[PDB]
Design a protein around this ligand. Sequence first.
Ligand code: ADP
Ligand code: MG
Ligand code: MG
Length: 209
Amino acid sequence: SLSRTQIVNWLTRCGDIFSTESEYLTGLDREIGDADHGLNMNRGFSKVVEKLPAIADKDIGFILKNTGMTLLSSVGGASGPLFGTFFIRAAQATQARQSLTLEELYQMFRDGADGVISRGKAEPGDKTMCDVWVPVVESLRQSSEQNLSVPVALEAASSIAESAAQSTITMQARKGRASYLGERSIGHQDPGATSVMFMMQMLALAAKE
Ligand SMILES: Nc1ncnc2c1ncn2[C@@H]1O[C@H](COP(=O)(O)OP(=O)(O)O)[C@@H](O)[C@H]1O
Ligand SMILES: [Mg+2]
Ligand SMILES: [Mg+2]
C-alpha cells in the first residue's frame, strides 16, 4: 500500500527536485522553448510545498486536488494547466482514501493521464509530457497485473520514466512552443517530459522500503 504520508513525502521531494533542477529544466526549455519551464515548475511546487503543513492531515484526494489547483494557479505557461489537471483528475478516483493500492495508483495515474491527454491533445511521439505519462501509466498497469508491491511497481515506473524522457530527445515536437522550432526540436530532451520523470523518481523514493 502507499500511505497518505508517503504521498505527502512525494510532493515534498518534488518541491526539492524542482528547486534543484530549475536551471537544468530551464536549460532544456531554452533549446526548444522560451526558457521558462524550470522557473515555472519551481514556482508551482514551492507553493505546493508551502501548503503541505496546513493540508497534510486531510485525505489523499484532498491533498492531490489541492496540489492540483496550486499548480493550476501557480505554474503558468502550458505545463501548469496540464500538471494541474493531472493532479485534480488524480484526486477524483481517490475516494477520500488514506492509503492506496497498486490498483488504485494505476487508476489514478490512468485518469490523470487521460486528463492531460484530453486537455492538450498530444499523441504518443509528439514530444511532450505525455510521452512519459503513457508508458508510466502502462508500467503501472502491468505491475498491477502482476500484483507487485507498490515500492517495486513505483521503482519500475520510475526507470521507464527515465527511458521515456530520454526517448523524447529524438522526437520532433508537434505540440506547444517546441513545435515552433520544427526540425530543430530533434536532438533535444523535452522539459515537460523531464518533469514527469522527476516526479516519478521522487515518487519511487517517497515510497522506498
Ligand atoms: N499539449 C501540450 N501543449 C504544449 N505543451 C505541452 C503539451 N503537453 C505537454 N506539454 C509540455 O509543456 C512543456 C512546456 O512547458 P513550459 O515551458 O512551462 O510552458 P511554455 O512552453 O508555455 O513556456 C513542454 O515541454 C511539453 O512537455
Ligand atoms: Mg517554456
Ligand atoms: Mg511560457
